[PDB]
């Protein structure tokens, strides 16, 4: 039976690989070869948020676009006000070992976790006037890798385990569970929509998936190494990704296949953060080396570089604005950068 | 008005300034190790669904953070990441066993991994009671499994501990040097690796862990001094 | 959350005495602490505040140096010390909580009060001190500045307050336009930045009360009675 049903599973794959195909008419470089280049895109650092002690290993900006949650591995979760830099909180936390954390788009909630395999949910806003832990969400049998809101009561994880699951916080329970990768869930991105959300794993496959339904719909197989990041082009229909084998791929869900690949053969670091501009026109893109790429989305290009951090860039973010883009590094300092 | 704000900035910047008095004073470690080593035991020895366990111990009055790392996945290759720039990882394995190639396998990959590489190793051959006992019971041929040890002899740098047998002691010094020429194949002199023969229950663990901490800051800070 | 204070009683402005509040429920440390009097028949009036840490404090022009206010963040309690009372000192004085960052609602809770019995700033004027009206029936409370108080950073630092007879004032809107936490859809408010307005729209039974006009660029209007 084993060897009928893989069988089975090996024709199904070629009939999709065949279907790529016949949709592949075109690349994406012979359609947007008419368009008008970015040129040289310059950015320069506005701000240096400092005060971490340990490698800044996640952030995430605010709806409101001023306030920027930030995570430490020396066990801290500062609330940053980024237009005058002023730390609005500093929120330590249980465990010291945070890979992700999140600001909920209300701003009344910060959630984070890591190795602890718990996602803690904070309150931001009590009447007690400190921060409290609202929930902690345990049922991972993984480091927590990502995680991000969908609401206030939503909160859908990443995990070091082969799982990725969707939370309840005013009970704690798995509203549901996400399965079908093989490796360590790396990286999660929501639609705008907040109906769908793509993820990426050790295996070097990205997978959307639908929240309210609870499964896989189709799956993306481009990457040669495993995926670090992955984000959401701003329409929602195509997501960009990066991986260990320093090439970031972009790719479509409705062609349901890959339309661009950036690389740079000098370029052999790995990528760790992936993050489109408000207009989807700049793919910004942070690597092992000190060092963010600025590429153009439609044409495959460095448009520019950030270059300001000491050592790993460990996460990027542009604001919902899109006024300014935001990097944390291993030593310990976030820079803004517009 | 804003002033408030810059004075709460200010207060939350001396507080985090008064936790980094006390990150900096105290000395993060990674355990590792295979299950049928005796880690687990290891830490609770300590007199002072989960993933990390904290285990806080003090010598000579220096702060030590001890992490095992519980439950996870069977493979290590991206969480290890945040372990990077610990004070040292001991590393501990069950010379009693074969698991021992799994061992070497896996201390192969932990030496050679691309963010260790500047983080020394407390090697643990741990179970050195039990290895004796299998040694003296003789039906365990270890040859069969490490056909070089029928033809190893051990070294004239070598000190036998009190009263031991020169077959345990040749054992012993033959898994110590089966890790040892792993650690000097590929460390450029950035990591070193501290082998030691150790119970669980031996009160002196600590102790090495405090000399080899010593050891490793020390070469850390004259690295940072450029005398070497 | 309670703010309940000790103290008060007959004086003569020959003595002195020493108002007192306790913290319960929250953590005080971290709140800036107000002084504020209600004078019998009269308005409000800032007396004096201590920022979070104690490491700011500002009086009022007729009692800076007059008195001093203290604060133990320990004991969660916070001091006043009164050296030379005179007879406007007559007053209930009210500590009042605050915190300030971005998006933070300062003078959100009042404590309970004690009243005390004896023997330039931007003056803030309401539009009438008192309007008949019935319950249902929407109505707009108004009130001008002595200048303008949209500051250069893009917020205009307007409160309004609600003392509802034999209560603590409660607040209603905190710059200008943001609902305190609790403060039913019923209010709404808004402003030119010099000139400013509250607005009920479905007053109900319990909206009666004096409403008070301040600004924090510490100054509160004279007061505008709803009188149901």
């Known amino acids: 039976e084993l060897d009928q049903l893989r069988q089975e599973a090996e024709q199904l794959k070629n009939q999709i690989r065949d279907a790529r195909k016949a949709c592949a008419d075109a690349t994406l470089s012979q359609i947007t070869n008419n368009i008008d280049p970015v040129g040289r895109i310059q950015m320069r650092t506005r701000r240096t948020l400092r005060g971490h002690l340990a490698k800044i290993y996640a952030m995430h900006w605010g709806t409101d676009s001023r306030l920027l949650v930030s995570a430490s591995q020396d066990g801290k979760l500062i609330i940053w006000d980024s237009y005058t830099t002023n730390k609005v909180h500093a929120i330590p936390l249980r465990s010291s070992w945070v890979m992700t954390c999140a600001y909920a788009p209300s701003g009344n909630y910060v959630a984070c976790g890591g190795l602890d395999n718990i996602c803690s949910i904070y309150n931001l806003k009590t009447r007690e006037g400190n921060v409290r832990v609202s929930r902690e969400l345990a049922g991972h049998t993984g480091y927590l890798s990502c995680c991000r809101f969908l609401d206030d009561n939503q909160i859908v994880t990443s995990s070091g385990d082969t799982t990725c699951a969707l939370w309840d916080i005013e009970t704690g329970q798995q509203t549901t569970t996400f399965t079908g990768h093989t490796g360590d869930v790396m990286s999660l991105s929501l639609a705008p929509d907040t109906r769908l959300f793509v993820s990426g794993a050790c295996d070097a496959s990205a997978k959307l998936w639908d929240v309210r339904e609870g499964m896989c719909r189709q799956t993306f197989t481009g990457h040669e190494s495993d995926i670090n990041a992955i984000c959401f082009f701003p329409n929602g229909n195509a997501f960009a990704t990066g991986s260990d084998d320093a090439t970031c791929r972009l790719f479509d869900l409705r062609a349901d296949q890959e339309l661009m690949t950036y690389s740079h053969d000098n370029i052999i670091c790995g990528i760790t953060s992936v993050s489109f501009s408000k207009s989807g026109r700049l793919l910004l893109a942070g690597y092992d080396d000190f060092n963010c790429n600025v590429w153009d989305a439609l044409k495959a290009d460095r448009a520019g570089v950030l270059a300001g951090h000491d050592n790993r860039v460990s996460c990027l973010g542009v604001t919902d604005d899109g006024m300014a883009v935001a990097t944390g590094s291993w030593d310990s300092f976030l820079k803004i950068w517009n | 008005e804003d002033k408030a704000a810059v004075e709460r900035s200010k207060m939350i910047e001396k507080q985090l300034q008064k936790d980094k008095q006390v990150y900096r004073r105290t000395l993060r470690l990674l355990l590792l190790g295979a299950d049928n080593s005796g880690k687990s035991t290891i830490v609770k020895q300590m007199r002072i669904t989960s993933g990390i366990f904290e285990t806080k111990f003090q010598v000579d009055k220096v702060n030590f953070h001890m992490f095992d790392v519980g439950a996870q996945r069977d493979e290590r290759r991206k969480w290890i990441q945040c372990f990077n720039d610990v004070t040292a990882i001991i590393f501990v394995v069950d010379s009693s066993d074969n698991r021992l190639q799994e061992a070497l396998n896996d201390f192969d990959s932990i030496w050679n991994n691309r963010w260790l590489r500047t983080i020394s190793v407390i090697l643990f051959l741990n179970k050195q009671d039990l290895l004796a006992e299998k040694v003296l019971a003789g039906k365990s041929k270890i040859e069969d499994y490490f056909p070089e040890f029928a033809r190893y002899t051990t070294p004239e740098d070598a000190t036998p501990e009190p009263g031991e047998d020169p077959r345990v002691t040749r054992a012993k010094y033959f898994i110590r040097k089966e890790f040892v020429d792993i650690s000097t194949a590929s460390g450029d002199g950035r990591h070193i690796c501290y082998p030691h023969f150790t119970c669980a229950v031996d009160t002196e663990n600590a102790r090495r862990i405090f000399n080899d901490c010593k050891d490793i800051i020390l070469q850390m800070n004259l690295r940072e001094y450029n005398l070497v | 959350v309670q703010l309940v204070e000790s103290g008060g009683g007959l004086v003569q402005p020959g003595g002195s005495r020493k108002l007192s509040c306790s913290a319960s429920?929250?953590?005080?440390?971290?709140?800036?602490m107000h002084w504020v009097r209600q004078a019998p028949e009269k308005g409000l009036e800032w007396v004096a505040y201590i920022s979070s840490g104690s490491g700011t404090i500002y009086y009022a022009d007729t009692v800076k140096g007059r008195f001093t206010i203290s604060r133990d963040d320990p004991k969660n309690t916070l001091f006043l010390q009164m050296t030379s009372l005179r007879s406007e000192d007559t007053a209930m004085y009210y500590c009042?909580?605050?915190?300030?960052?971005?998006?933070?609602?300062?003078?959100?809770?009042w404590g309970q009060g004690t009243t005390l019995t004896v023997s330039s700033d931007i003056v803030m004027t309401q539009a009438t001190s008192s309007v008949p009206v019935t319950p249902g029936e929407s109505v707009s409370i108004s009130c001008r500045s002595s200048?303008?108080?949209?500051?250069?950073?893009?917020?205009?630092?307007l409160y309004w307050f609600l003392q509802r007879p034999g209560q603590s004032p409660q607040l209603l809107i905190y710059?200008?336009?943001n609902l305190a936490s609790g403060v039913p859809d019923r209010f709404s408010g808004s402003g030119s930045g010099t000139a400013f307005t509250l607005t009920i729209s479905r007053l109900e039974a319990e909206d009666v009360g004096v409403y008070y006009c301040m600004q924090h660029l510490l100054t509160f209007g004279a007061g505008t009675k709803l009188e149901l």
């Open positions: 009042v909580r605050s915190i300030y960052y971005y998006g933070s609602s300062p003078f959100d809770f």
């Open positions: 429920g929250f953590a005080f440390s971290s709140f800036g």
């Open positions: 710059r200008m336009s």
């Open positions: 200048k303008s108080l949209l500051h250069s950073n893009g917020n205009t630092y």
